[PDB]
Design a protein around this ligand. Structure first.
Ligand code: HEC
Length: 104
């Protein structure tokens, strides 16, 4: 993906509820630093729904590609409000940006 476009997408569609920087505060949603290779529902200090807490998957590109297309469908009962990113290219860009920034 295009990391720069991914950043734009993050700023426009995710930043209002999430941070990606280390020690960034929990907002409406959990901080996403260290997201890749981590199980669902594990950010310490965030109170998840039971659905998100017990989804039982590992966040990585494949799982993010599916989630971000339609969060509700992938984790029914999530309290995250997001319709989904319908275009594959934009999803890849965002995911590529998150892969960089959440490990940075
Ligand atoms: C508020 C309006 C949000 C927007 C916009 C986005 N997210 Fe979100 N996200 C939000 C909440 C409240 C939660 C917790 C959900 C629950 O049911 O407990 C989430 C959760 C996630 C997760 C899962 C993280 C985990 O630790 O398991 C991810 C990966 C995530 N959110 C990513 C994400 C992205 C990439 C967004 C923009 C594309 C985005 N979210 C928007 C609240 C909100």
């Amino acid at each position: 993906g295009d990391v720069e476009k991914g950043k734009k997408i993050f700023v426009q569609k995710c930043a209002q509820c999430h941070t990606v920087e280390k020690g960034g505060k929990h907002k409406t949603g959990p901080n996403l630093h260290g997201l890749f290779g981590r199980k669902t529902g594990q950010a310490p200090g965030f109170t998840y729904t039971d659905a998100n807490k017990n989804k039982g998957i590992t966040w990585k590109e494949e799982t993010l590609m599916e989630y971000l297309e339609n969060p509700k469908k992938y984790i029914p009962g999530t309290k995250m409000i997001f319709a989904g990113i319908k275009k594959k290219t934009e999803r890849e860009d965002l995911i590529a940006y998150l892969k960089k920034a959440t490990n940075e």
